Amino acid sequence: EPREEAGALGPAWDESQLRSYSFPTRPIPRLSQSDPRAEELIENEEPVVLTDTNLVYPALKWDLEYLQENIGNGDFSVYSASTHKFLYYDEKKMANFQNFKPRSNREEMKFHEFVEKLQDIQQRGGEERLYLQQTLNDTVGRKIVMDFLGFNWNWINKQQGKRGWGQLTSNLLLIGMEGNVTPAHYDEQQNFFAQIKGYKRCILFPPDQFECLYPYPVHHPCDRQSQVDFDNPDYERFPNFQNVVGYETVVGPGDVLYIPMYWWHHIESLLNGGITITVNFWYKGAPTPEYPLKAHQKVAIMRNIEKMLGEALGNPQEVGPLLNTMIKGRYN
Amino acid sequence: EPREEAGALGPAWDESQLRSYSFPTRPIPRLSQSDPRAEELIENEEPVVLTDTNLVYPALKWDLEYLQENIGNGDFSVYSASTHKFLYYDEKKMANFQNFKPRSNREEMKFHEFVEKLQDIQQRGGEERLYLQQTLNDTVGRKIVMDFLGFNWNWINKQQGKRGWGQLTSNLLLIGMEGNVTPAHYDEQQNFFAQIKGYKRCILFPPDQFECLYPYPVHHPCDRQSQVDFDNPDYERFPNFQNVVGYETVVGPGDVLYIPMYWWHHIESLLNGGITITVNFWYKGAPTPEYPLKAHQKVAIMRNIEKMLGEALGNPQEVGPLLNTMIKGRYN
Numbered sequence A, B: 001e002p003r004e005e006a007g008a009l010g011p012a013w014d015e016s017q018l019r020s021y022s023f024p025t026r027p028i029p030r031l032s033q034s035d036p037r038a039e040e041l042i043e044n045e046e047p048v049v050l051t052d053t054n055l056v057y058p059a060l061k062w063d064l065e066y067l068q069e070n071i072g073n074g075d076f077s078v079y080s081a082s083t084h085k086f087l088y089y090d091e092k093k094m095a096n097f098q099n100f101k102p103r104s105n106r107e108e109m110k111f112h113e114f115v116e117k118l119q120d121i122q123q124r125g126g127e128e129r130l131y132l133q134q135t136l137n138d139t140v141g142r143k144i145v146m147d148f149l150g151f152n153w154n155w156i157n158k159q160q161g162k163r164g165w166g167q168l169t170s171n172l173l174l175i176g177m178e179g180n181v182t183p184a185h186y187d188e189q190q191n192f193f194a195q196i197k198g199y200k201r202c203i204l205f206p207p208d209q210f211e212c213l214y215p216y217p218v219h220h221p222c223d224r225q226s227q228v229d230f231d232n233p234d235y236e237r238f239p240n241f242q243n244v245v246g247y248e249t250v251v252g253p254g255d256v257l258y259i260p261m262y263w264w265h266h267i268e269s270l271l272n273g274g275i276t277i278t279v280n281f282w283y284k285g286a287p288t289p290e291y292p293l294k295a296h297q298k299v300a301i302m303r304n305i306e307k308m309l310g311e312a313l314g315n316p317q318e319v320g321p322l323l324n325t326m327i328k329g330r331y332n
C-alpha cells in the first residue's frame, strides 16, 4: 500500500501508475540500515530496500536544471526508443547475429542537448522516448564532484568490506521519462541502486528462476536479458514463465535497493510520474572459493559452457546445434 | 555376394546367416595391403578390409583344442548372457546408476573351464550363450608366445608409424558362439581387427552419425554404446535412427578390418557358423594438434562437456537437468 509523503503531501503514487503483468509478487522488505535484518539480507544476497543510508544525500536536490548547469560538457549516452521498452544490447556482439535489429538506438550528446530533446518532445506531444544512461566520470563539473564526494562512502565502503566484494566498477547515471521500462535481465555485479528523483517500480526474480525467464544465448547481443515479452508472454515458447514469481517494490528519492548479483530485475518508471533519476553503484563480486551448489553458481557454469563451446567450435552460431545433439535422445 | 572358398569348397556363408535390420548399408572395400587405395583409406580414417596382411598368420591354426593345450593357466574373462546381445558395460561406473541391471555377467575362469562350459551347453541343448573376451598377457604359454611373435609386426608397426598413432595398448582375444552380437558402440582407439576363425558380420557407422545412434550418457555404464535396440528400434525416443546408414562387411580367417577411432561398430558372429575367434590390435590415437572441425572432434567436445559438468556439479545425475535448463527456450 503506497506510503504517505511526509507533511501530508499525500500518497507518493497509486496503483494506476503500475503496469499490469501476469505474475504474482511479494514485497521486498524496507528496512533501516541499522536493522540487523537488513544486514542478514545483504549478507545472504537477498534484496532489501534501505530507507535511510543517506547514500546519495547530496544528489537529492538534482534535477535537469541543476545538472545542466553543473555536469560538465562531456558526452552522454542517450537511448531512443519507439516503445516503452528499452531492451539492453551489447554492440560488441552485434556482428555475430546479423539478423538482430535493435528497437532502440544510442546517441552521444551533450547534457544540454538531451534536455532540449526532452523539451522538444514534450512540447510537440511526440511519442518518442529517451533514456539517458551514462557512467559518471572526470568530465563532470565542480559542484557535481562536490556532491559525489558527499555520498556516504563511509557506509558503502563498509558494505564492500563486510561482503568481501571487489572494487567499485562504476556508477551509472540513469535519467528516464515516465513510463520507461528496463526489461528484465541480470547483471554480474553486486548493485546498490540509489533512487534520487521520481519513483521506480522494481521487480526482482531470484537466480533459481532461470528456467522461467529464458535468457538469450550468451553470444547474443541480449545476453543476460530474458526473451520473454512481459507485456505479451508467449507461453508456447516459454512455458515456465507461467511459474515465475517476483519480489517487488517501489523506490523513491532517498531509498537504496540492494540488487544482488545474478538476481533478475525489471525496472519501470511510474506512469505519469515524471522523470526519474537514479544512480547505481556496481561492485565486482567476491571471489569464487561446497555442495550443494547455489543457483547462481549453476548459472555461472552454464554461461561458461556456452562461452567454451563458442570458442571451441569457432562459430557461436554452432553452439545450439551441438547442445541439441548432445541431449536429444540422451538427456531429455 | 558371398566369396567362394578356394578349392571349390563353396560359399563361405549365405544371406540366411545374417540378422535382418531396418537400415541400408554399403560395402566396405576389400583390398590388398599393397593397393594404394587401402593406404588412402586408412590415412583418412575410413574403414577397409585388408585381405593379405598376414597379420596373424600363425594364429590361423588356432582352435579350442590348440588354445586349451597352450594358452596357459591364467584367468580368462567370460561373459554370459540370455540373449544374443552382449551389451558392454563398465563396472567402474555401476555405482552412479544403481538402477542399471546388466543383461550379461562376467565370470573369471580357466581356459579349460570355458571350453568345458561350451561343451556342456552344446550337449545339454542349452540356450545360454558365452563370449570370452580377454586381453592377451604374460601368462600365456610358450607356443602361444611363439605364435604372437610371429604376427606381422613389420607391417603393423609401419602402420602405427605412418599414422603417428600412439602405442599398442592391447590385443583382445575374442572367442564367441555363433549368433553372438556385440551391439553398436564406438571405441576411443584405432583398431586393427584380425579375424582368425569363423566369420563376423561387421556393421560400421561413421562418427557423423552420432545424432542417429544416441549413445548413453558418458557417466553411464554403457558409455559409448548406442541406446537403440537394433532388433526393435523405438523411433519415438530415437527418431533419427530412421536415417542411419551403414558400411558393412563379412570378415573371415585372414582378413583384417580397420575400424577407425570414433567409428561406430556392430559385430555379429554368423548364425549357424560355429565359433569365432578374433584378435584386435588397439592403438592410442595420434595427438590433438583447424576449422572446420571434424565430426569426431565434435564428439570429443561433447564428451568433455559431459565429464566437466559431472565433476563441477558433484553428481553426474545432475548433468541432464542442467543441460535441459540450458537449451529449452534458448537453443532448441
Ligand SMILES: O=C(O)CCC(=O)C(=O)O
Pocket: A174, A181, A182, A187, A191, A193, A265, A267, A268, A278, A280
Ligand atoms: O534503472 C534502470 O532502468 C536499469 C538499472 C539496472 O538495470 C541496473 O542498475 O542493473
Ligand SMILES: O=C(O)CCC(=O)C(=O)O
Pocket: B174, B181, B182, B187, B191, B193, B265, B267, B268, B278, B280
Ligand atoms: O568382435 C566383437 O564382438 C567386438 C570387437 C569390438 O567391438 C572392438 O574390437 O572394438
Ligand SMILES: [Fe+2]
Pocket: A185, A186, A187, A265
Ligand atoms: Fe541491471
Ligand SMILES: [Fe+2]
Pocket: B185, B186, B187, B265
Ligand atoms: Fe569395439
